[PDB]
């Protein structure tokens, strides 16, 4: 169960909102937690996308406008985050506190993916350009783009922000910004000139940027995307 995985990280704020959801305008403005919003069909691909995003952006709260961000936190003249903020008073009243910094995404100020879509497919998958080698078709290990891997709740496909953009155009585009998913580490290295932003190998390591290579014993992230039901 995914809510237990949220509640394991007791120093987070996502566990605080999950404890609210089990039992103000904070939970009215907040759309929710990133790991709640995305669903992945299999297990391994969900694990590696979670290892790509990390446990800090995976447990990010997602709210609509910046007024909700000002609702979540309150600053005095000292510049310190006192107890009198929103989720700090809420956690002090209910239970566990928040000692870790956590991520607050606002969907209004994000950069929408103002590019064409696939016409006939459900979930409004992105019409993004696929790379090709000099000889022929696609690179040999090319499984596809990771922003189109996410299986989403059909309530959130339209009019989530004020301009009528979806949630794949705003949230998951700005988390998974055009990164390839490859089957083999060797197929990821052999197609290194064609990858623009990032690449994720379906067995092992990943790369965030062009020159930056992540390698070594694979650090795991406890939170994963849910199964689709």
């Amino acid at each position: 169960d995914i809510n237990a995985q949220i509640l394991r990280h007791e120093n987070s704020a996502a566990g605080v909102l999950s404890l609210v959801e089990t039992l103000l305008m904070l939970t009215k403005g907040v759309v929710g937690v990133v790991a709640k919003l995305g669903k992945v069909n299999d297990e391994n691909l969900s694990q590696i996308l979670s290892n790509y995003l990390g446990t800090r952006s995976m447990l990010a709260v997602v709210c609509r406008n910046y007024e909700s961000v000002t609702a979540l936190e309150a600053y005095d003249n000292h510049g310190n985050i006192d107890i009198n903020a929103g989720l700090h008073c809420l956690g002090s009243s209910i239970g566990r506190e928040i000692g870790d910094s956590f991520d607050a995404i606002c969907l209004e100020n994000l950069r929408p993916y103002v590019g064409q879509h696939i016409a006939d497919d459900l979930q409004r998958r992105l019409d993004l350009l696929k790379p090709k080698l000099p000889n022929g078709e696609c690179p040999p290990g090319f499984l596809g783009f990771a922003v189109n891997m996410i299986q989403i709740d059909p309530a959130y496909l339209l009019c989530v922000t004020s301009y009528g953009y979806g949630l794949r155009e705003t949230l998951f585009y700005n988390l998974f910004s055009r990164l390839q998913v490859y089957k083999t580490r060797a197929d990821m290295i052999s197609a290194l000139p064609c990858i623009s932003d990032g690449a994720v190998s379906l067995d092992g390591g990943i790369i965030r940027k062009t020159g930056i290579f992540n390698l070594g014993n694979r650090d795991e992230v406890n939170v994963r995307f849910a199964k689709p039901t």
Partner: protein, 125 residues
């Protein structure tokens, strides 16, 4: 002592670049962000250098986009990459066959450290 060395180096380099063929199969799609990123990825797929003048031109194209808030527009979306890859191949063929080494030696004399643009990639093997 300077100008004779510059002229003889420019003549040797121009002869070497005129020697290099342009490849047969050029059907590929390279999603790219800047011009220099396309040039680097295309040097890596096709094991061939580019000219000096080609790399100067691509850097000046890439500097021409600074300023107006067009960097936030991904250049992949403005120009289809098959089109821009065709531009860079045809401009490379222009800079390989047409130029005289005297003008290029003048340009090398105008600024030191001209090896920043000359590629160490050899088409052999």
């Amino acid at each position: 002592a300077d100008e004779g060395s510059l002229l003889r180096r420019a003549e040797m380099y121009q002869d070497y670049m005129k020697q290099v063929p342009i490849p047969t199969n050029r059907g590929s799609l390279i999603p790219f962000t800047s011009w220099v990123g396309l040039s680097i990825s295309m040097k890596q797929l096709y094991g061939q250098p580019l000219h000096y003048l080609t790399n100067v031109l691509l850097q000046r194209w890439d500097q021409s986009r600074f300023g107006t808030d067009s960097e936030e527009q991904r250049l992949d979306s403005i120009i289809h990459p098959t089109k821009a890859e065709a531009t860079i191949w045809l401009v490379e063929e222009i800079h390989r066959l047409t130029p005289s080494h005297l003008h290029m030696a003048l340009l090398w004399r105008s600024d030191p450290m001209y090896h920043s643009f000359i590629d160490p990639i050899f088409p052999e093997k």
